[PDB]
Write a protein that binds this ligand. Structure first.
Ligand SMILES: C[C@H](CCC(=O)NCCC[N+](C)(C)CCCS(=O)(=O)[O-])[C@H]1CC[C@H]2[C@@H]3[C@H](O)C[C@@H]4C[C@H](O)CC[C@]4(C)[C@H]3C[C@H](O)[C@]12C
Ligand SMILES: Nc1ncnc2c1ncn2[C@@H]1O[C@H](CSCC[C@H](N)C(=O)O)[C@@H](O)[C@H]1O
Ligand code: SF4
Ligand SMILES: [C-]#N
Ligand SMILES: [Cl-]
Ligand SMILES: [Cl-]
Ligand SMILES: [Fe+2]
Length: 356
């Protein structure tokens, strides 16, 4: 019987980069790009993604100020510190006046988008959110909501109240793992929400965690292909960070390099999308968001949740630095952007269609 030797690894890695540069995004090519463990291949992939980012989204790093206004959640996701079964966390809700005034302060510090994010907290839904959104829209900025899965009628009310964008990370495109990790719901529910949000005219954001328990490289390829299929306006990617007060406490943490390759491939697949350097990337490696901004990301989301709430929004350990004042994050990220040679966004930074 005759032999079947593999190709040399250097020549394989060079061929994969060429396929990516020519935009031949077959499953095998995406799988091999995520499986190669070579510093020189990875650096060339990050440079390709940085090139694409320069050409189709430019040098602005858009600043979105987030206010995490309630840590109450009716769901029980196995990865999240806010899951309802975690009784070892003090819960909070901000008043609408606190939220609106905190948003006004971020606008005065120069944020051109306000992100409102919460647990799935029924107290607010739908009418308290609508009132808050109407007040923030009078400040002349964009509004992004990130409130979870709700009925079409609620999404429609919030669009009429003026909301521009909605971030609903898809978490994992594998439906069997999705149901195991999110026992209240399903990938079909999550996708139907994203489809409803797009049909209503929101700019929509999806995106997965990298390194979840049970997730394989083939699953990460399916996440990339799902993102490509829908041409999402925004994509939020970060590593899974185990939380000690959850069932996943003892599982492996998501790997930084693999997550950065996911960000880089997402930029290559979706050249004009908005891609944050997420909080979780800054949690796992010192300077992690700065690195990610050189590997295809073009958005940063400074934490604008005020004390004493901000330290209770404990999605994962290490998320909040207790050492600086709760107005430090917007000037800090502006300094970071300056030192990278980039500039803050000039307008609201909505996704544009310039590729093709
Ligand atoms: C902190 C500085 C010093 C060395 C720099 C990295 C290296 O240059 C390798 C690589 C080049 C890509 O171009 C962009 C990404 C990456 C990881 C850089 C990111 C970042 O800038 C680093 C970590
Ligand atoms: N342990 C963990 N590690 C990393 N990211 C996590 C995490 N737990 C939650 N997250 C991320 O935090 C995001 C926001 S949770 C708040 C918004 C809303 N309840 C929703 O679920 O969409 C989730 O989309 C998820 O990707
Ligand atoms: S990920 Fe969102 S829905 Fe799930 S428990 Fe956390 S806050 Fe609730
Ligand atoms: C999220 N950053
Ligand atoms: Cl946004
Ligand atoms: Cl921050
Ligand atoms: Fe985020």
């Amino acid at each position: 019987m005759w032999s079947h030797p593999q190709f040399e690894k250097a020549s394989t890695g060079r061929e994969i980069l060429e396929k990516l540069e020519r935009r031949e995004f077959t499953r095998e090519v995406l799988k091999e790009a995520l499986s190669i463990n070579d510093r020189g291949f990875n650096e060339a992939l990050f440079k390709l993604a940085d090139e694409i980012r320069r050409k189709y989204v430019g040098d602005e790093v858009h600043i979105r100020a987030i206010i995490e206004f309630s840590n109450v959640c009716r769901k029980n996701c196995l990865y999240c510190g806010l899951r309802r079964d975690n009784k070892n966390l003090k819960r909070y809700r901000m008043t609408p006046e606190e939220i609106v005034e905190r948003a006004r302060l971020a606008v005065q510090f120069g944020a051109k988008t306000i992100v409102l994010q919460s647990g799935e907290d029924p107290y607010y839904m739908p009418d308290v959110i609508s009132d808050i959104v109407k007040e923030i829209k009078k400040m002349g900025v964009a509004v992004t909501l990130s409130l979870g899965e709700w009925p079409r009628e609620y999404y429609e009310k919030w669009k009429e109240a003026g909301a521009d964008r909605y971030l609903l990370r898809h978490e994992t495109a594998n439906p069997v793992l999705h149901r195991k990790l999110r026992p209240d719901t399903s990938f079909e529910n999550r996708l139907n929400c994203l489809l409803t949000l797009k049909e209503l005219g929101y700019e929509t954001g999806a995106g997965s965690m990298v390194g979840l328990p049970g997730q394989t490289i083939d699953d990460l390829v399916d996440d990339l292909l799902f993102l490509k299929e829908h041409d999402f306006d925004m994509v939020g990617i970060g590593p899974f960070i185990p939380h000690p007060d959850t069932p996943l406490a003892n599982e492996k943490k998501g790997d930084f390099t693999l997550t950065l390759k996911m960000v880089a491939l997402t930029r290559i697949l979706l050249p004009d999308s908005n891609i944050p350097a997420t909080t979780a990337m800054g949690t796992i490696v010192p300077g992690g968001r700065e690195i990610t901004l050189r590997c295809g990301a073009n958005v940063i989301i400074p934490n604008w949740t005020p004390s004493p709430y901000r330290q209770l929004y404990q999605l994962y350990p290490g998320k909040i630095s207790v050492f600086e004042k709760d107005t430090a994050s917007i000037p800090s990220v502006m300094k970071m952007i300056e030192l990278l040679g980039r500039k803050p966004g000039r307008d609201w930074g909505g996704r544009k269609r310039v590729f093709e």
